[PDB]
Amino acid sequence: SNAILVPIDISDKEFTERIISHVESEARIDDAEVHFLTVIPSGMDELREGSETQLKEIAKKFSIPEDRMHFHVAEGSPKDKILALAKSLPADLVIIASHRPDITTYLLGSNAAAVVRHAECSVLVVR
Amino acid sequence: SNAILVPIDISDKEFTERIISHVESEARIDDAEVHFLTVIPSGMDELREGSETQLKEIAKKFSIPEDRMHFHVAEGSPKDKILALAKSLPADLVIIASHRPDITTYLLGSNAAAVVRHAECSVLVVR
Ligand SMILES: Nc1ncnc2c1ncn2[C@@H]1O[C@H](COP(=O)(O)OP(=O)(O)OP(=O)(O)O)[C@@H](O)[C@H]1O
Numbered sequence: 001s002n003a004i005l006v007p008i009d010i011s012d013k014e015f016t017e018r019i020i021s022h023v024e025s026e027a028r029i030d031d032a033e034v035h036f037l038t039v040i041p042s043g044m045d046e047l048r049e050g051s052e053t054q055l056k057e058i059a060k061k062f063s064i065p066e067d068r069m070h071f072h073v074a075e076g077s078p079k080d081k082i083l084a085l086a087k088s089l090p091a092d093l094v095i096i097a098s099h100r101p102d103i104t105t106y107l108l109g110s111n112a113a114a115v116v117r118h119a120e121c122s123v124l125v126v127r
Numbered sequence: 128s129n130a131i132l133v134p135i136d137i138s139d140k141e142f143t144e145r146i147i148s149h150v151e152s153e154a155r156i157d158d159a160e161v162h163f164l165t166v167i168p169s170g171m172d173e174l175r176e177g178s179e180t181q182l183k184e185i186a187k188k189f190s191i192p193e194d195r196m197h198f199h200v201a202e203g204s205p206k207d208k209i210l211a212l213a214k215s216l217p218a219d220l221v222i223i224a225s226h227r228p229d230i231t232t233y234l235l236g237s238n239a240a241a242v243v244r245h246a247e248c249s250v251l252v253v254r
């Protein structure tokens with residue numbers, strides 16, 4: 001895949017660690033561009049900047065060349081903004097965890113489910 | 128991924144051609160073992176053998192080393208047998224198309240939906 005969209009919820013009390021190896025492997029296939037996105041509640045400039053900082057800190061966990069990482073912050077519904085960016089990039093692949101790591105009630109979380117169903121590109125659900 | 132499960136519906140009047148590049152790429156990441164599975168209605172020996180022959184013919188479309196391809200025929204519910212084999216292999220990845228290529232009513236077909244939700248491993252929905 002050329003353009004890989006990697007949505008990350010920065011509030012994940014516990015980060016979804018298993019996505020790291022998958023993002024790294026998928027990126028190595030074609031030296032993809034890796035686009036990290038976090039969607040926050042909709043001052044806002046300050047909230048956006050702090051969200052971007054947290055997202056870059058998470059991205060430090062990934063072995064991907066610096067030149068290939070790109071960062072995006074959006075506001076509102078996570079599924080809507082994930083899908084809008086997948087369309088506009090456009091993404092060749094979206095890589096999403098099945099749900100938050102500490103919660104097992106739902107086999108797919110609401111955003112994972114929507115994104116796998118509605119994306120126009122391939123979607124890798126990681127567990 | 129080490130063991131990749133690739134379920135194929137051999138009756139697909141039109142084969143899902145976009146899965147080829149994805150299976151091939153995913154297999155190249157770690158020289159995975161690639162397990163093709165087709166699930167048929169439940170003489171049966173003859174039906175199983177003919178189904179396996181059709182499945183091997185489809186597999187000829189894929190650029191994967193011969194040593195790494197493996198073939199499986201099961202009987203009954205496709206989602207149940209896909210998930211059973213994913214568990215028993217065990218599969219590190221299941222690669223499935225979103226739906227049949229000629230039918231657009233449902234953004235996810237019934238088997239794609241079940242498998243993405245219920246697999247214990249990562250699942251790549253291809254479109
Ligand atoms: N606010 C967000 N911004 C970016 N990506 C997100 C956001 N929320 C969820 N995601 C993406 O979707 C994945 C699955 O999260 P999801 O929210 O679907 O599960 P959950 O939190 O367990 O369920 P729910 O939010 O429905 O209670 C996350 O790992 C992440 O990739």
Ligand SMILES: Nc1ncnc2c1ncn2[C@@H]1O[C@H](COP(=O)(O)OP(=O)(O)OP(=O)(O)O)[C@@H](O)[C@H]1O
Nearest residue numbers: 134135136165166205223224226227236237238239
């Ligand atoms: N009988 C089968 N054996 C092996 N894999 C199958 C079978 N049926 C479906 N699949 C797998 O699931 C994928 C999606 O097919 P699915 O059956 O979910 O979609 P569909 O045929 O459009 O929907 P439906 O069967 O619900 O009308 C297929 O491309 C294939 O990977």
Ligand SMILES: [Mg+2]
Nearest residue numbers: 009100109111
């Ligand atoms: Mg959530």
Ligand SMILES: [Mg+2]
Nearest residue numbers: 136227236238
């Ligand atoms: Mg079907």
